[PDB]
Design a protein around this ligand. Structure first.
Ligand SMILES: Cc1cc2nc3c(=O)[nH]c(=O)nc-3n(C[C@H](O)[C@H](O)[C@H](O)COP(=O)(O)O)c2cc1C
Ligand SMILES: Cc1cc2nc3c(=O)[nH]c(=O)nc-3n(C[C@H](O)[C@H](O)[C@H](O)COP(=O)(O)O)c2cc1C
Ligand SMILES: [Cl-]
Lengths: 122, 122
C-alpha cells in the first residue's frame, strides 16, 4: 500500500517521528529515514537502541503513528511533502525481521511496523 | 529552556512532528522547521492551516510533544541531533502571537507552544 512518493522521500535524509500511547498522554520518539528498511507485506523496520518507553507502550497498545517527509520531493501543491502512517508495532529480537537491521551494531531489537494506512498529508 | 543546539537545528530545513492526545490514541501532525517562530518566554509558534483534529485534542489536553532534528548539527556521539520538546499548547487567531506567523496567508491560526522542557535525545 505504501506509494512510490513515500519511497522517493526515503531517498532523502530526514527525521522520522513515531508516536505511541503512554499511560498519561502520548509519547514521541525518532529515527532517521535512511535507517528504515521496507519489507514486503507492508512492513517498515526501525533499528532499536533505546525505545524502552516506546516498547512498554506498544506492549499495552500496539497501534502507532509515524510521520516523515522531505523538502526535496514534490507535494500536491509545491515542493515538499510527507506522510502520516498508521500501523501496528512489534519488537523483534531474532529471526529475519531482526536480521533486517543487523547492519546497526548498537541495535537491541527491530521495531516492525505493519502499515494499515499511508496518507500523503501535503 | 531552548538551548543553542536547538537554534542550530533551525538553521536547516526539516520536518517537525507534533503529537497530541486524541480520543482513541495519539494524534501526530507536521510543520516545517523553517516555519517555526521562536518568541521570548520559551514560546514556539507554528502557522496553522489545518490542524483541526489537533486543535480539538489541545482543547481537551493542552500538553503536546514536538520533535525535530538535523543531520547537519553535531549530536553527542556523531553527526546528527534532535530534540524532544514538551509544552502546553494554545491556538490564537489574533494578537501578537498570531501576528508572529500572519505572513503565512494560508494560516487560520497560530499554534503557540509554551515549552516546559527540551531534551537533546541524540
Ligand atoms: C534524529 C534522531 C534519530 C534517532 N534515531 C534512533 C534510532 O534509530 N533508534 C533508537 O532507538 N533511538 C533513536 N533516537 C532516540 C529516540 O528518539 C529516543 O529518544 C530513545 O530511543 C529513547 O526512547 P524512549 O523515550 O521510548 O525510551 C533518535 C533520536 C533522534 C533525535
Ligand atoms: C512536511 C509537512 C509540513 C506541514 N506543514 C503544516 C503546517 O505548517 N501547518 C498546518 O496546519 N499543516 C501542515 N501540514 C499538514 C498537517 O501535518 C496536518 O496533516 C493537517 O494540518 C491536518 O491536521 P489534523 O489531522 O490535526 O486535522 C504539513 C504536513 C507535512 C507532511
Ligand atoms: Cl526535509
Amino acid at each position: 500500500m505504501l506509494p512510490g512518493t513515500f519511497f522517493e522521500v526515503l531517498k532523502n535524509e530526514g527525521v522520522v517521528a513515531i508516536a505511541t500511547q503512554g499511560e498519561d498522554g502520548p509519547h514521541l520518539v525518532n529515527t532517521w529515514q535512511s535507517y528504515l528498511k521496507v519489507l514486503d507485506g507492508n512492513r517498515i523496520v526501525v533499528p532499536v537502541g533505546g525505545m524502552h518507553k516506546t516498547e512498554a507502550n506498544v506492549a499495552r497498545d500496539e497501534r502507532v503513528l509515524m510521520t516523515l517527509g522531505s523538502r526535496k520531493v514534490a507535494g500536491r501543491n509545491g515542493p515538499g511533502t510527507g506522510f502520516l502512517i498508521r500501523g501496528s508495532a512489534a519488537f523483534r529480537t531474532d529471526g529475519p525481521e531482526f536480521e533486517a537491521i543487523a547492519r546497526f551494531k548498537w541495535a537491541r531489537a527491530a521495531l516492525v511496523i505493519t502499515v494499515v494506512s499511508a496518507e500523503q498529508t501535503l
